[PDB]
Design a protein around this ligand. Structure first.
Ligand SMILES: [Cu+]
Ligand SMILES: [Cu+]
Ligand SMILES: [Zn+2]
Ligand SMILES: [Zn+2]
Lengths: 153, 153
């Protein structure tokens, strides 16, 4: 099994730790942890291409997209590899994250280790907003917190 | 080429940005950047095993050592893969980092992507110190700043 971890931080109050675990290389990645400091409701949640935080979350570049597809939700055949949809924060501003995804991986061409996990200002519209930006970012707005995804013990 | 980057941060004044570039997968890796906030003199500089910052730099674990060797300087045959020796801070507390290394790699099954880069309190004794700790850490002391090594554009 392979494990990964990401510490999410940004300019504002959003802070979290997200864990990744993959039992087999041909199998799903479990993604779980807790993010606090969020507004209540939905927040876009993606893996971005670059593990570069030199200019904060901006330098992470676009969604991780090695198959050159349009943005979607995690359930869509047409999605970026990095498209994990939304997380939901409760009234106290905490998102208890629990996702399973078969398109991200912790090895190979879909490997997300060394890339950046980002949590966003607004809901990800999952490619259904009827504008060009919906097909790129899901209209998820600004990057509230991010972190480079590292190999974990 | 393959490129990586690391933002070094800690609990004190030490901070910097370190770049990695590898023109050929079977070629050397160039490592360069700057670190500020350091005491004048030598400071140990290594890749540690885990890209885990959940408990600060402590959770990075030991030096990255997939070949199970003793601690060395970068020129030694007997070294950890992560052993990049010392950087030197000037009278203003600034270390201009400029390293070329043929043991670390940005690709392949022992790559340093997703691991942690650490700059230390004290000089690395290059495993020549004559105590057990010399053979593990070079007696480089505490971890002043660290960051996960990420994929760069
Ligand atoms: Cu995103
Ligand atoms: Cu170290
Ligand atoms: Zn996307
Ligand atoms: Zn070492």
């Amino acid at each position: 099994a392979t494990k990964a971890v990401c510490v999410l931080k940004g300019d504002g109050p959003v802070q979290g730790i997200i864990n990744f675990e993959q039992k087999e290389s041909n199998g799903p990645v479990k993604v779980w942890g807790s993010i606090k400091g969020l507004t209540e409701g939905l927040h876009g949640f993606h893996v971005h291409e670059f593990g570069d935080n030199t200019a904060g979350c901006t330098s992470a570049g676009p969604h991780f997209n090695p198959l050159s597809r349009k943005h979607g939700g995690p359930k869509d055949e047409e999605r970026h590899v990095g498209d994990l949809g939304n997380v939901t924060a409760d009234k106290d501003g905490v998102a208890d994250v629990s996702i399973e995804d078969s398109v991200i991986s912790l090895s190979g061409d879909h490997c997300i280790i060394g890339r950046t996990l980002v949590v966003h200002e607004k809901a990800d519209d999952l490619g259904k907003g009827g504008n060009e930006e919906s097909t790129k970012t899901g209209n998820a707005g600004s990057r509230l917190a991010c972190g480079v995804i590292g190999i974990a013990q």
